[PDB]
Write a protein that binds this ligand. Structure first.
Ligand SMILES: [Cl-]
Ligand SMILES: [Cl-]
Ligand code: NA
Ligand code: NA
Ligand code: NA
Lengths: 171, 171
């Protein structure tokens, strides 16, 4: 440790894109690609967010730009998103695409479908957020997806993303 | 919001260096510069870390490399570090430089001088962490500094860092 943190990768077969997901959603964090919201919203205050694959809501912000989330509007219910940590590929399936106002901070609650809850989450979600409409920032386009598969990396890379090679996740 | 986070800048007059500090201390977070540990260690588990200037321990990891923390060993008690958020320049003064083992996670506790505490911190620290010795990772070089001044940015940039211009913190 010091530091002991890992990063994740995100793959989207539908748009044929993938990124390393950095931590944080500040301007410098997401300048070049998507970032993970380190905290989830609850009525009682902000709490540490789910790590990749874990119960809660792993939420990712990315700019509405060519190399990042321009095409998030193309995702439909059923579509697969894969989140990779050091150990596993986690396959999530899109359950909802919606448009919200920028103050709908509910969408990054541990359970975005029960944001007023104060109990521990039991379901693992992935949430993608970007600016909406295209060439505006009046709103946010939100994609929520639910964990459907956990594949240990020992078993190799899922076929749907096997062509998505790195150039170069843990220290 | 969505996202509503900000980033910070870190200035070190002694070595004449400055960076935008990103969120997170994963390999992708700190590939090109220093990053903020999003969570502080406590005996009862990880808790959200201090934001810039705030009670707790704002801790920053940086590689022991030329453009980042190579020269952290040159810092001495009394030396100034400035942390900038959207509103203020926060001047911390180095109180301790030490070498620890890699698993000394205590150094990122909200009060690194009383890591077993389970109380709310009252003092604002800044901690820098890097690999030690040079060209090794057997140890970590730790600099802890304590908040001595909060200057609203409306008053202009302190003389000691006024020459340290950006090329280009909030969304
Ligand atoms: Cl549009
Ligand atoms: Cl050395
Ligand atoms: Na990224
Ligand atoms: Na980051
Ligand atoms: Na940085």
């Amino acid at each position: 440790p010091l530091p002991g943190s890992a990063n994740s990768r995100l793959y989207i077969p539908k748009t044929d894109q993938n990124w390393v997901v950095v931590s944080g959603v500040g301007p410098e964090d997401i300048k070049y690609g998507p970032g993970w919201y380190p905290e989830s919203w609850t009525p009682e205050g902000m709490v540490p967010a789910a790590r990749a694959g874990q119960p809660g809501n792993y939420a990712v912000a990315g700019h509405r730009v060519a190399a990042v989330f321009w095409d998030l509007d193309k995702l439909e219910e059923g579509d697969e998103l894969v989140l990779e940590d050091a150990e596993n590929f986690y396959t999530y399936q899109v359950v909802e695409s919606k448009v919200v106002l920028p103050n709908a901070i509910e969408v990054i609650a541990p359970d975005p479908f029960n944001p007023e809850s104060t109990e521990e989450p039991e379901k693992a979600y992935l949430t993608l957020t970007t600016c909406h409409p295209k060439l505006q920032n009046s709103h946010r386009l939100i994609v929520h997806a639910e964990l459907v598969d956990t594949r240990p990396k020992e078993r190799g890379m899922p076929d749907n993303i096997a062509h998505m090679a790195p150039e170069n996740l843990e220290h």
